[PDB]
């Protein structure tokens, strides 16, 4: 829960007036940094925009960095048909006293690469990991330079950003006629934090399952979510649903 | 690779008519990164809208939230139109004031 | 060694009077008040009163009061509440504690149980309980009454899935309770299971095996 | 009376986890506030005096704020020592008053039980009496529901339920219900159930037997 993260994004063929390339930064579920190609400069992103400094422009020499080799990237593929290349670079909390760090890299939607700490170098098992791995590896400095911040900058900082926001959902249960002999009873949790939350349903007192589950972020920093079962007519006013969120005392029960 | 939009369509705070709150579109899920998204009122484009930055979740599919301030009347209709490399047409997503 | 040491459990009829005792030792009783506090069944606290030994004075709750005495003995280092027109209401857990002017209690005693009814003392009846992978066995501790009673198993050599239920009130005015124990199933055979109840009010033990 | 209105009266929470329970009182009672602990079979135990003081020995974890009315006890990383009841108390004016206490609970995952029927005993046979007994064996959470079936008649009002507290390794609970009917009633019927509705089971475990 206590993470600092950052996404990063490479395309091979930007729509017209897109970036091929743009990062976002996360400390817990909140974003705080944003850049891309275009601009070409790490941006404060909400409450950081309001500041005194030297952080932002190192932050902005990385990433110019990773801009120039993730679309470097590219060209060890040789292929026709687009490529996404996404990385995911940071480090945990862990249960210890520790870093967990995370350096994974997805090409076309699924992962392929990763930077292996103990030896200090990408690597991977499809020939585009070990073509992109090398053509990276050719650059001194930069197993160095991703070796530093995921054992040493990273974990600094997550420490360092030390020195617990709740907010309960607002619930509603309603039901809506469904097919013929049939309705759907959907729970629904309006702007909560933080974002663990859980529903359930029963009936009569017993496990209805879980419904079909849906959630999404509020422009806040809230977030909602929602659940939906389909139950036979007549029948609706034999259910309730249960939400469990760390804005409650106790598991909430929600009625028709 | 290719994955289709999964589009989420709700208020921020339970909807009553004449009360101020927000409208969102949650795209979520998709890929390629590729995607437009509009907010419409009664049939046609709203103008006054902003978005987050487009990130991606640990299974490596994008997503995206648009969103608006606006004020739920009785008649008014609001939808969501996405249009992503994976949709034969771009899908509407009504807003149900139930969900 | 600072404490306060509460006078035994005590059993008394409507109408009737209570005196509980509570001893100071390990501090100079004369240079602190007393408090009293009552806590009857699964329900929360209340102040009855305190008193301050050099002066005399008591400072009393009015929902008492008509029938709560509060008093202290310089020469055994003894405070005392009496407690008049005994009714079933009063039945509780009364504390005393060592209070200042300026502080909350941080010494209390542990308590002395007041029942207030007319049943008599009685000794319990002990039936056995008994009927997969994982069996379970029990006693079921039926018809005393003062309460409480402590039930082991094997002598207390078997405490692993014990479960032992807070005692409930039944409409003959006397307890009951059961006390059960779930086992491997194999075990059945050759090992021997036996609850040992202890019912210290009416003076009587029971070892029950149960099969 | 100053009033102390405590809440919320009970919550479930996890190790390690920031718990948050508030008193108001009905009068300025001025910072003249004490905070208790209390485990069961024990007396109240002080851990903060005047609002804010920690007692000797109280570990930092626990802290206590406010001014005027409003106040709070904040245990800032919960450990398992802590699952108890606490209680707040104004010691400003008299009568002094206590709050209503909150219970602090174990959370832990939702557990189905595992049910037993027990027939009367025939030692017990002979005293005019039946109790015939179902046990509902380490579940979670603590609401359940226990129906009593004669042959098949529901009985409703001849049967009284009894609860543990929290397991010492498992968080769960355990439940007796016992079924009271007089020898002859017993006698004159088949088949005893009883039938277990818990949100942790998908339909009702029915456990029976009949006499014989």
């Known amino acids: 829960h206590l993470s600092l993260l950052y996404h990063l994004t490479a395309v091979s063929s930007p729509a017209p007036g897109t970036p091929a390339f743009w990062v976002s930064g996360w400390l817990g579920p909140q974003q705080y940094l944003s850049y891309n190609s275009l601009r070409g400069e790490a941006e404060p992103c909400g409450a950081w925009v309001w500041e005194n400094s030297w952080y932002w422009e190192k932050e902005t020499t990385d990433l110019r960095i990773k801009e120039k080799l993730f679309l470097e990237a590219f060209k060890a593929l040789g292929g026709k048909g687009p490529y996404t290349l996404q990385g995911l670079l940071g480090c945990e909390l862990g249960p210890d006293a520790t870093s967990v760090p995370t350096a994974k890299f997805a090409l076309n939607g699924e992962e392929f690469m990763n930077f292996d700490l103990k030896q200090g170098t990408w690597g991977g098992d499809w020939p585009e990991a070990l073509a992109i791995s090398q053509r990276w590896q050719q650059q001194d400095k930069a197993a160095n330079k991703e070796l530093t911040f995921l054992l040493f900058s990273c974990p600094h900082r997550l420490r360092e950003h030390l020195e617990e926001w709740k907010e309960p959902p607002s619930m509603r249960l309603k039901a809506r006629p469904s097919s013929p002999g049939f309705s759907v009873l959907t729970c629904s949790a309006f702007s909560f934090y933080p974002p663990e939350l859980q529903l359930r349903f029963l009936r009569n007192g017993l496990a209805a399952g879980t419904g079909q589950g849906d959630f999404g972020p509020n422009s806040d920093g809230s977030f909602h979510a929602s659940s939906s079962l389909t139950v036979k007519s007549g029948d609706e006013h034999h259910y309730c649903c249960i939400v469990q969120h760390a804005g409650l005392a106790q598991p909430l029960r929600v009625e028709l | 690779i290719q994955r289709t939009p999964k589009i989420q369509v709700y208020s921020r705070h339970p909807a009553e008519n004449g009360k101020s709150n927000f409208l969102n579109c949650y795209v979520s899920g998709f890929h390629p990164s590729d995607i437009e998204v509009d907010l419409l009122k009664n049939g046609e484009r709203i103008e006054k809208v902003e978005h987050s930055d487009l990130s991606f979740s640990k299974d490596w599919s994008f997503y995206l939230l648009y969103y608006t301030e606006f004020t739920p009347t009785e008649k008014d209709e609001y939808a969501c139109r996405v249009n992503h490399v994976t949709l034969s047409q771009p899908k509407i997503v009504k807003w149900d004031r139930d969900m | 060694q600072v404490q306060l040491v509460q006078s035994g459990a005590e059993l008394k009829k409507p109408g009737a009077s209570v005196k509980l005792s509570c001893k100071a030792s390990?501090?100079?009783?004369?240079?602190?008040?007393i408090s009293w506090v009552k806590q009857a069944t699964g329900q929360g606290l209340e102040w009855i009163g305190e008193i301050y030994p050099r002066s005399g004075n008591t400072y009393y709750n009015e929902k008492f009061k008509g029938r709560a005495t509060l008093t202290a003995d310089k020469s055994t280092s003894t405070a005392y509440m009496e407690l008049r027109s005994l009714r079933s209401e009063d039945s509780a857990v009364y504390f005393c504690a060592r209070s200042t002017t300026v502080r909350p209690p941080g010494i209390w005693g542990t308590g002395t149980t007041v029942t207030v009814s007319s049943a008599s003392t009685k000794g319990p009846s002990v039936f056995p309980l008994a009927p997969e992978s994982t069996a379970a066995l029990g006693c079921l501790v039926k018809d005393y009454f003062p309460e409480p009673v402590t039930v082991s198993w094997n002598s207390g050599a078997l405490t692993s899935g014990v479960h032992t239920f807070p005692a409930v009130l039944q409409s003959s005015g006397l307890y009951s309770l059961s006390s059960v124990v779930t086992v491997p199933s194999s075990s059945l055979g050759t090992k021997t299971y036996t609850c040992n109840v202890d019912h210290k009010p009416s003076n009587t033990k029971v070892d029950k095996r149960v099969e | 009376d100053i009033q102390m209105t405590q809440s919320p009266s009970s919550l479930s929470a996890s190790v390690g986890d920031r718990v948050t329970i508030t008193c108001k009182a009905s009068?300025?009672?001025?910072?003249?506030l004490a905070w208790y602990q209390q485990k069961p079979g024990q007396a109240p135990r002080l851990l903060i005096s005047?609002?804010?003081s920690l007692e000797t020995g109280v570990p930092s974890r626990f802290s206590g704020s406010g001014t005027g009315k409003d106040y709070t006890l904040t245990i800032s990383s919960l450990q398992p020592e802590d699952f108890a009841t606490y209680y707040c108390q104004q010691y400003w004016s008299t009568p002094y008053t206590f709050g209503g206490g909150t219970k602090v609970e174990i959370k832990r995952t939702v557990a189905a039980p595992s049910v037993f029927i027990f027939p009367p005993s025939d030692e017990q046979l002979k005293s005019g009496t039946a109790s015939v007994v179902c046990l509902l064996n380490n579940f979670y959470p603590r609401e359940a529901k226990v129906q009593w079936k004669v042959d098949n008649a529901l009985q409703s009002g001849n049967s009284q339920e009894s609860v543990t507290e929290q397991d010492s390794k498992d968080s769960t609970y355990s439940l007796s219900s016992t079924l009271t009917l007089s020898k002859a009633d017993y006698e004159k019927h088949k088949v005893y159930a009883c039938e277990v509705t818990h949100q942790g089971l998908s339909s009702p475990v029915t456990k029976s037997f009949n006499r014989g």
């Open positions: 390990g501090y100079t009783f004369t240079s602190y008040g």
């Open positions: 005047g609002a804010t």
């Open positions: 009068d300025h009672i001025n910072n003249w």
